[PDB]
mmCIF file with all atom_site columns, all heavy atoms in Angstrom:
data_model
loop_
_atom_site.group_PDB
_atom_site.id
_atom_site.type_symbol
_atom_site.label_atom_id
_atom_site.label_alt_id
_atom_site.label_comp_id
_atom_site.label_asym_id
_atom_site.label_entity_id
_atom_site.label_seq_id
_atom_site.pdbx_PDB_ins_code
_atom_site.Cartn_x
_atom_site.Cartn_y
_atom_site.Cartn_z
_atom_site.occupancy
_atom_site.B_iso_or_equiv
_atom_site.pdbx_formal_charge
_atom_site.auth_seq_id
_atom_site.auth_comp_id
_atom_site.auth_asym_id
_atom_site.auth_atom_id
_atom_site.pdbx_PDB_model_num
ATOM 1   N N   . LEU N 1 208 ? 32.579 70.695 -14.272 1.00 66.21 ? 208 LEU N N   1
ATOM 2   C CA  . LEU N 1 208 ? 31.393 70.906 -13.449 1.00 66.21 ? 208 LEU N CA  1
ATOM 3   C C   . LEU N 1 208 ? 31.678 71.093 -11.966 1.00 66.21 ? 208 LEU N C   1
ATOM 4   O O   . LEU N 1 208 ? 30.863 71.698 -11.273 1.00 66.21 ? 208 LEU N O   1
ATOM 5   C CB  . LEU N 1 208 ? 30.425 69.728 -13.616 1.00 66.21 ? 208 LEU N CB  1
ATOM 6   C CG  . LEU N 1 208 ? 29.437 69.792 -14.793 1.00 66.21 ? 208 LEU N CG  1
ATOM 7   C CD1 . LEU N 1 208 ? 28.677 71.104 -14.766 1.00 66.21 ? 208 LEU N CD1 1
ATOM 8   C CD2 . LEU N 1 208 ? 30.145 69.603 -16.123 1.00 66.21 ? 208 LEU N CD2 1
ATOM 9   N N   . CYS N 1 209 ? 32.811 70.586 -11.470 1.00 65.13 ? 209 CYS N N   1
ATOM 10  C CA  . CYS N 1 209 ? 33.090 70.643 -10.041 1.00 65.13 ? 209 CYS N CA  1
ATOM 11  C C   . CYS N 1 209 ? 33.548 72.038 -9.626  1.00 65.13 ? 209 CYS N C   1
ATOM 12  O O   . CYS N 1 209 ? 34.292 72.701 -10.345 1.00 65.13 ? 209 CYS N O   1
ATOM 13  C CB  . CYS N 1 209 ? 34.157 69.613 -9.667  1.00 65.13 ? 209 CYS N CB  1
ATOM 14  S SG  . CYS N 1 209 ? 33.500 67.974 -9.284  1.00 65.13 ? 209 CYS N SG  1
ATOM 15  N N   . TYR N 1 210 ? 33.088 72.465 -8.454  1.00 65.93 ? 210 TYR N N   1
ATOM 16  C CA  . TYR N 1 210 ? 33.480 73.745 -7.879  1.00 65.93 ? 210 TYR N CA  1
ATOM 17  C C   . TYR N 1 210 ? 33.417 73.640 -6.364  1.00 65.93 ? 210 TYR N C   1
ATOM 18  O O   . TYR N 1 210 ? 32.677 72.822 -5.815  1.00 65.93 ? 210 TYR N O   1
ATOM 19  C CB  . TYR N 1 210 ? 32.603 74.889 -8.382  1.00 65.93 ? 210 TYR N CB  1
ATOM 20  C CG  . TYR N 1 210 ? 31.248 74.978 -7.716  1.00 65.93 ? 210 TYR N CG  1
ATOM 21  C CD1 . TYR N 1 210 ? 31.010 75.907 -6.708  1.00 65.93 ? 210 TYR N CD1 1
ATOM 22  C CD2 . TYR N 1 210 ? 30.207 74.143 -8.095  1.00 65.93 ? 210 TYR N CD2 1
ATOM 23  C CE1 . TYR N 1 210 ? 29.769 75.992 -6.102  1.00 65.93 ? 210 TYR N CE1 1
ATOM 24  C CE2 . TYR N 1 210 ? 28.972 74.221 -7.489  1.00 65.93 ? 210 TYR N CE2 1
ATOM 25  C CZ  . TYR N 1 210 ? 28.757 75.147 -6.494  1.00 65.93 ? 210 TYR N CZ  1
ATOM 26  O OH  . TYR N 1 210 ? 27.523 75.230 -5.890  1.00 65.93 ? 210 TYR N OH  1
ATOM 27  N N   . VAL N 1 211 ? 34.197 74.478 -5.693  1.00 63.19 ? 211 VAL N N   1
ATOM 28  C CA  . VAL N 1 211 ? 34.270 74.469 -4.236  1.00 63.19 ? 211 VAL N CA  1
ATOM 29  C C   . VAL N 1 211 ? 33.236 75.434 -3.679  1.00 63.19 ? 211 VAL N C   1
ATOM 30  O O   . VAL N 1 211 ? 33.200 76.608 -4.061  1.00 63.19 ? 211 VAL N O   1
ATOM 31  C CB  . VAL N 1 211 ? 35.684 74.838 -3.750  1.00 63.19 ? 211 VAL N CB  1
ATOM 32  C CG1 . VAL N 1 211 ? 35.668 75.101 -2.252  1.00 63.19 ? 211 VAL N CG1 1
ATOM 33  C CG2 . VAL N 1 211 ? 36.665 73.739 -4.081  1.00 63.19 ? 211 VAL N CG2 1
ATOM 34  N N   . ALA N 1 212 ? 32.400 74.941 -2.769  1.00 62.30 ? 212 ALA N N   1
ATOM 35  C CA  . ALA N 1 212 ? 31.406 75.789 -2.122  1.00 62.30 ? 212 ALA N CA  1
ATOM 36  C C   . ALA N 1 212 ? 32.025 76.493 -0.926  1.00 62.30 ? 212 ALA N C   1
ATOM 37  O O   . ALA N 1 212 ? 32.773 75.898 -0.148  1.00 62.30 ? 212 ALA N O   1
ATOM 38  C CB  . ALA N 1 212 ? 30.208 74.958 -1.674  1.00 62.30 ? 212 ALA N CB  1
ATOM 39  N N   . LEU N 1 213 ? 31.714 77.783 -0.784  1.00 63.70 ? 213 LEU N N   1
ATOM 40  C CA  . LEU N 1 213 ? 32.239 78.557 0.341   1.00 63.70 ? 213 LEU N CA  1
ATOM 41  C C   . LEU N 1 213 ? 31.723 78.012 1.667   1.00 63.70 ? 213 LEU N C   1
ATOM 42  O O   . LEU N 1 213 ? 32.487 77.897 2.633   1.00 63.70 ? 213 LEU N O   1
ATOM 43  C CB  . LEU N 1 213 ? 31.871 80.031 0.178   1.00 63.70 ? 213 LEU N CB  1
ATOM 44  C CG  . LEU N 1 213 ? 32.581 81.007 1.115   1.00 63.70 ? 213 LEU N CG  1
ATOM 45  C CD1 . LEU N 1 213 ? 34.059 80.668 1.225   1.00 63.70 ? 213 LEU N CD1 1
ATOM 46  C CD2 . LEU N 1 213 ? 32.393 82.441 0.643   1.00 63.70 ? 213 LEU N CD2 1
ATOM 47  N N   . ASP N 1 214 ? 30.439 77.688 1.736   1.00 62.88 ? 214 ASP N N   1
ATOM 48  C CA  . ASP N 1 214 ? 29.833 77.101 2.932   1.00 62.88 ? 214 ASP N CA  1
ATOM 49  C C   . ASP N 1 214 ? 29.244 75.749 2.566   1.00 62.88 ? 214 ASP N C   1
ATOM 50  O O   . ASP N 1 214 ? 28.330 75.668 1.744   1.00 62.88 ? 214 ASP N O   1
ATOM 51  C CB  . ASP N 1 214 ? 28.756 78.025 3.508   1.00 62.88 ? 214 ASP N CB  1
ATOM 52  C CG  . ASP N 1 214 ? 29.246 79.441 3.705   1.00 62.88 ? 214 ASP N CG  1
ATOM 53  O OD1 . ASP N 1 214 ? 30.406 79.610 4.137   1.00 62.88 ? 214 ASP N OD1 1
ATOM 54  O OD2 . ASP N 1 214 ? 28.475 80.390 3.435   1.00 62.88 ? 214 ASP N OD2 1
ATOM 55  N N   . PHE N 1 215 ? 29.777 74.691 3.180   1.00 66.57 ? 215 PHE N N   1
ATOM 56  C CA  . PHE N 1 215 ? 29.305 73.344 2.869   1.00 66.57 ? 215 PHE N CA  1
ATOM 57  C C   . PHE N 1 215 ? 27.905 73.101 3.408   1.00 66.57 ? 215 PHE N C   1
ATOM 58  O O   . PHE N 1 215 ? 27.043 72.570 2.700   1.00 66.57 ? 215 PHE N O   1
ATOM 59  C CB  . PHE N 1 215 ? 30.276 72.308 3.427   1.00 66.57 ? 215 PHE N CB  1
ATOM 60  C CG  . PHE N 1 215 ? 30.117 70.941 2.834   1.00 66.57 ? 215 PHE N CG  1
ATOM 61  C CD1 . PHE N 1 215 ? 29.754 70.786 1.503   1.00 66.57 ? 215 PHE N CD1 1
ATOM 62  C CD2 . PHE N 1 215 ? 30.315 69.808 3.601   1.00 66.57 ? 215 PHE N CD2 1
ATOM 63  C CE1 . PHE N 1 215 ? 29.605 69.528 0.961   1.00 66.57 ? 215 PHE N CE1 1
ATOM 64  C CE2 . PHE N 1 215 ? 30.167 68.547 3.063   1.00 66.57 ? 215 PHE N CE2 1
ATOM 65  C CZ  . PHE N 1 215 ? 29.807 68.407 1.739   1.00 66.57 ? 215 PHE N CZ  1
ATOM 66  N N   . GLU N 1 216 ? 27.657 73.475 4.666   1.00 64.32 ? 216 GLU N N   1
ATOM 67  C CA  . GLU N 1 216 ? 26.352 73.228 5.270   1.00 64.32 ? 216 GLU N CA  1
ATOM 68  C C   . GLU N 1 216 ? 25.259 74.042 4.594   1.00 64.32 ? 216 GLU N C   1
ATOM 69  O O   . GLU N 1 216 ? 24.156 73.534 4.361   1.00 64.32 ? 216 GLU N O   1
ATOM 70  C CB  . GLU N 1 216 ? 26.392 73.534 6.775   1.00 64.32 ? 216 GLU N CB  1
ATOM 71  C CG  . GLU N 1 216 ? 27.488 72.816 7.568   1.00 64.32 ? 216 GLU N CG  1
ATOM 72  C CD  . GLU N 1 216 ? 28.885 73.382 7.345   1.00 64.32 ? 216 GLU N CD  1
ATOM 73  O OE1 . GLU N 1 216 ? 29.058 74.246 6.456   1.00 64.32 ? 216 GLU N OE1 1
ATOM 74  O OE2 . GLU N 1 216 ? 29.813 72.958 8.062   1.00 64.32 ? 216 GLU N OE2 1
ATOM 75  N N   . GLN N 1 217 ? 25.542 75.301 4.270   1.00 65.04 ? 217 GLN N N   1
ATOM 76  C CA  . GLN N 1 217 ? 24.529 76.146 3.630   1.00 65.04 ? 217 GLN N CA  1
ATOM 77  C C   . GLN N 1 217 ? 24.166 75.624 2.245   1.00 65.04 ? 217 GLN N C   1
ATOM 78  O O   . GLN N 1 217 ? 22.995 75.662 1.850   1.00 65.04 ? 217 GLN N O   1
ATOM 79  C CB  . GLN N 1 217 ? 25.026 77.586 3.546   1.00 65.04 ? 217 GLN N CB  1
ATOM 80  C CG  . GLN N 1 217 ? 23.919 78.623 3.644   1.00 65.04 ? 217 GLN N CG  1
ATOM 81  C CD  . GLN N 1 217 ? 24.410 80.035 3.378   1.00 65.04 ? 217 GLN N CD  1
ATOM 82  O OE1 . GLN N 1 217 ? 25.602 80.258 3.174   1.00 65.04 ? 217 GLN N OE1 1
ATOM 83  N NE2 . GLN N 1 217 ? 23.487 80.990 3.374   1.00 65.04 ? 217 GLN N NE2 1
ATOM 84  N N   . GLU N 1 218 ? 25.161 75.139 1.496   1.00 63.16 ? 218 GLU N N   1
ATOM 85  C CA  . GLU N 1 218 ? 24.888 74.649 0.150   1.00 63.16 ? 218 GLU N CA  1
ATOM 86  C C   . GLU N 1 218 ? 24.081 73.358 0.163   1.00 63.16 ? 218 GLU N C   1
ATOM 87  O O   . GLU N 1 218 ? 23.325 73.091 -0.775  1.00 63.16 ? 218 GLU N O   1
ATOM 88  C CB  . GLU N 1 218 ? 26.199 74.450 -0.613  1.00 63.16 ? 218 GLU N CB  1
ATOM 89  C CG  . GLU N 1 218 ? 26.073 74.634 -2.114  1.00 63.16 ? 218 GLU N CG  1
ATOM 90  C CD  . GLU N 1 218 ? 26.247 76.081 -2.549  1.00 63.16 ? 218 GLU N CD  1
ATOM 91  O OE1 . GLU N 1 218 ? 26.214 76.974 -1.682  1.00 63.16 ? 218 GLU N OE1 1
ATOM 92  O OE2 . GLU N 1 218 ? 26.412 76.316 -3.768  1.00 63.16 ? 218 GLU N OE2 1
ATOM 93  N N   . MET N 1 219 ? 24.224 72.545 1.215   1.00 64.23 ? 219 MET N N   1
ATOM 94  C CA  . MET N 1 219 ? 23.440 71.318 1.311   1.00 64.23 ? 219 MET N CA  1
ATOM 95  C C   . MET N 1 219 ? 21.944 71.621 1.343   1.00 64.23 ? 219 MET N C   1
ATOM 96  O O   . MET N 1 219 ? 21.155 70.961 0.666   1.00 64.23 ? 219 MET N O   1
ATOM 97  C CB  . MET N 1 219 ? 23.846 70.519 2.558   1.00 64.23 ? 219 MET N CB  1
ATOM 98  C CG  . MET N 1 219 ? 25.245 69.897 2.540   1.00 64.23 ? 219 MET N CG  1
ATOM 99  S SD  . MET N 1 219 ? 26.047 69.495 0.962   1.00 64.23 ? 219 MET N SD  1
ATOM 100 C CE  . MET N 1 219 ? 24.818 68.503 0.106   1.00 64.23 ? 219 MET N CE  1
ATOM 101 N N   . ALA N 1 220 ? 21.546 72.618 2.138   1.00 64.87 ? 220 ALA N N   1
ATOM 102 C CA  . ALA N 1 220 ? 20.136 73.005 2.184   1.00 64.87 ? 220 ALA N CA  1
ATOM 103 C C   . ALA N 1 220 ? 19.669 73.540 0.839   1.00 64.87 ? 220 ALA N C   1
ATOM 104 O O   . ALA N 1 220 ? 18.568 73.220 0.382   1.00 64.87 ? 220 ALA N O   1
ATOM 105 C CB  . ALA N 1 220 ? 19.908 74.028 3.289   1.00 64.87 ? 220 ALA N CB  1
ATOM 106 N N   . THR N 1 221 ? 20.495 74.357 0.191   1.00 67.34 ? 221 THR N N   1
ATOM 107 C CA  . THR N 1 221 ? 20.134 74.889 -1.120  1.00 67.34 ? 221 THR N CA  1
ATOM 108 C C   . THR N 1 221 ? 20.052 73.774 -2.162  1.00 67.34 ? 221 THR N C   1
ATOM 109 O O   . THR N 1 221 ? 19.132 73.765 -2.993  1.00 67.34 ? 221 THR N O   1
ATOM 110 C CB  . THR N 1 221 ? 21.141 75.954 -1.557  1.00 67.34 ? 221 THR N CB  1
ATOM 111 O OG1 . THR N 1 221 ? 21.115 77.037 -0.622  1.00 67.34 ? 221 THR N OG1 1
ATOM 112 C CG2 . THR N 1 221 ? 20.796 76.485 -2.942  1.00 67.34 ? 221 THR N CG2 1
ATOM 113 N N   . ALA N 1 222 ? 20.993 72.835 -2.129  1.00 66.84 ? 222 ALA N N   1
ATOM 114 C CA  . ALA N 1 222 ? 20.994 71.747 -3.104  1.00 66.84 ? 222 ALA N CA  1
ATOM 115 C C   . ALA N 1 222 ? 19.754 70.874 -2.962  1.00 66.84 ? 222 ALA N C   1
ATOM 116 O O   . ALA N 1 222 ? 19.152 70.469 -3.969  1.00 66.84 ? 222 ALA N O   1
ATOM 117 C CB  . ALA N 1 222 ? 22.261 70.908 -2.953  1.00 66.84 ? 222 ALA N CB  1
ATOM 118 N N   . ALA N 1 223 ? 19.360 70.563 -1.727  1.00 71.61 ? 223 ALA N N   1
ATOM 119 C CA  . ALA N 1 223 ? 18.187 69.724 -1.521  1.00 71.61 ? 223 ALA N CA  1
ATOM 120 C C   . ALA N 1 223 ? 16.901 70.480 -1.831  1.00 71.61 ? 223 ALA N C   1
ATOM 121 O O   . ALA N 1 223 ? 15.993 69.945 -2.480  1.00 71.61 ? 223 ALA N O   1
ATOM 122 C CB  . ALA N 1 223 ? 18.161 69.199 -0.084  1.00 71.61 ? 223 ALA N CB  1
ATOM 123 N N   . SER N 1 224 ? 16.807 71.733 -1.393  1.00 70.76 ? 224 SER N N   1
ATOM 124 C CA  . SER N 1 224 ? 15.584 72.507 -1.602  1.00 70.76 ? 224 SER N CA  1
ATOM 125 C C   . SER N 1 224 ? 15.400 72.865 -3.072  1.00 70.76 ? 224 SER N C   1
ATOM 126 O O   . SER N 1 224 ? 14.303 72.733 -3.620  1.00 70.76 ? 224 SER N O   1
ATOM 127 C CB  . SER N 1 224 ? 15.611 73.771 -0.741  1.00 70.76 ? 224 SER N CB  1
ATOM 128 O OG  . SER N 1 224 ? 16.644 74.650 -1.163  1.00 70.76 ? 224 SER N OG  1
ATOM 129 N N   . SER N 1 225 ? 16.470 73.317 -3.726  1.00 68.81 ? 225 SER N N   1
ATOM 130 C CA  . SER N 1 225 ? 16.411 73.786 -5.104  1.00 68.81 ? 225 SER N CA  1
ATOM 131 C C   . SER N 1 225 ? 17.371 72.981 -5.967  1.00 68.81 ? 225 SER N C   1
ATOM 132 O O   . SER N 1 225 ? 18.522 72.768 -5.579  1.00 68.81 ? 225 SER N O   1
ATOM 133 C CB  . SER N 1 225 ? 16.741 75.278 -5.195  1.00 68.81 ? 225 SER N CB  1
ATOM 134 O OG  . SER N 1 225 ? 18.100 75.512 -4.875  1.00 68.81 ? 225 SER N OG  1
ATOM 135 N N   . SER N 1 226 ? 16.897 72.541 -7.127  1.00 67.08 ? 226 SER N N   1
ATOM 136 C CA  . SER N 1 226 ? 17.733 71.832 -8.083  1.00 67.08 ? 226 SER N CA  1
ATOM 137 C C   . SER N 1 226 ? 18.443 72.758 -9.054  1.00 67.08 ? 226 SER N C   1
ATOM 138 O O   . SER N 1 226 ? 18.833 72.319 -10.136 1.00 67.08 ? 226 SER N O   1
ATOM 139 C CB  . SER N 1 226 ? 16.894 70.806 -8.859  1.00 67.08 ? 226 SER N CB  1
ATOM 140 O OG  . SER N 1 226 ? 16.383 69.808 -7.998  1.00 67.08 ? 226 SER N OG  1
ATOM 141 N N   . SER N 1 227 ? 18.604 74.041 -8.699  1.00 65.91 ? 227 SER N N   1
ATOM 142 C CA  . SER N 1 227 ? 19.304 74.971 -9.578  1.00 65.91 ? 227 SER N CA  1
ATOM 143 C C   . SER N 1 227 ? 20.759 74.578 -9.754  1.00 65.91 ? 227 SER N C   1
ATOM 144 O O   . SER N 1 227 ? 21.364 74.840 -10.799 1.00 65.91 ? 227 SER N O   1
ATOM 145 C CB  . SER N 1 227 ? 19.194 76.390 -9.016  1.00 65.91 ? 227 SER N CB  1
ATOM 146 O OG  . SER N 1 227 ? 19.789 76.484 -7.734  1.00 65.91 ? 227 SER N OG  1
#
Side-chain angles (χ1 to χ4, degrees):
Chain N
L208 274 307
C209 273
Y210 78 101
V211 169
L213 192 43
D214 309 320
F215 197 35
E216 306 74 353
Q217 212 188 357
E218 209 87 347
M219 291 335 307
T221 299
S224 66
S225 68
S226 296
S227 61

